[PDB]
């Protein structure tokens, strides 16, 4: 547990360190788009590279699935005219086992498993 008292998705240490690993990689790849134009090529470049990166994490099993959203649906001209560029990553991180419950049932002689359980 991280030190949070309010609930939040970034509660467990593994989720925190996952989003650190992503932010500290994509937050480097994106540096190469500073002082570019916000043209169609810049957008497709940043979509393809970061998708290629997250596909690696998806295969190794850090995230169940992800989407990269980066086009005219958010880089509207009202963003362009103030020298800004935007992208959104939707990421669902892996669960984990935390609580293990084992039941032992001390059944009788007779009373066989072909009747109770039925293989």
């Amino acid at each position: 547990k991280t030190a949070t008292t309010v609930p939040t998705p970034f509660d467990r240490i593994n989720v925190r360190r996952l989003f650190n690993m992503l932010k500290n990689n994509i937050g480097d790849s994106s540096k190469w788009q500073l002082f570019e134009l916000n043209d169609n090529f810049t957008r497709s470049s940043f979509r393809m590279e970061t998708s290629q990166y997250l596909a690696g994490i998806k295969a190794l099993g850090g995230v169940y699935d992800f989407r990269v959203v980066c086009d005219t649906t958010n880089n509207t001209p009202a963003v362009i005219d103030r020298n800004e560029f935007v992208a959104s990553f939707y990421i669902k991180p892996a669960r984990s086992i935390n609580y293990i419950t084992l039941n032992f049932v001390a059944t009788a002689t007779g009373a066989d498993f072909d009747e109770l359980i039925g293989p």
Partner: protein
């Protein structure tokens, strides 16, 4: 799901069957650059069958080791081949003498390494304990054998590897 094969190389790559070197302290640095090929050793533990009724179940037998066979490039003044034979000469004297030193003298340590695809980095390293050269191979010299460099096999015995 084809990207799943990336789990087969979390470490960064497949191992490569040619990115290796052999070190044998007795023979100096230059042997490590002259050794062409060497099998990273086998580990053999032969099964024992235990019969019950008319079926058999297996149990672990007792560990054994096969010999270790390398292949060497030879230079124009035979600085390796004369050294390997002069090593074997301690195990049992070559020529007209009938002599050979104690096992503590002719046994030597050796090391096999495999590098990462960054040539700086060693990723696996096995020591082999108590080498000595049981058989130094022939060189099959022949006037029709043109356009090859001279190579020979050598078969060391070993006591164990780690």
């Amino acid at each position: 799901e084809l990207t799943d094969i990336t789990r087969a190389f979390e470490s960064g790559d497949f191992a490569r069957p040619n990115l290796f070197e052999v070190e044998i302290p007795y023979l100096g640095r230059n042997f490590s650059f002259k050794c062409k090929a060497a099998p990273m050793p086998a580990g053999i533990v032969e099964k024992v069958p235990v019969g019950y009724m008319n079926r058999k179940i297996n149990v672990a037998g007792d560990r054994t080791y096969d010999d270790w066979t390398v292949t060497i490039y030879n230079d124009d003044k035979h600085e390796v081949r004369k050294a390997i034979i002069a090593w074997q000469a301690q195990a049992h004297a070559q020529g007209n003498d009938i002599s050979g030193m104690t096992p503590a003298d002719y046994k030597k340590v050796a090391t096999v390494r495999q590098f990462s695809r960054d040539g700086k980095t060693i990723t696996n390293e096995h020591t082999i304990t108590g080498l000595w050269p049981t058989n130094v191979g022939e060189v099959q010299m022949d006037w029709d054998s043109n356009n090859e460099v001279e190579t020979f096999e050598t078969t060391f015995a070993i006591d164990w590897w780690e």
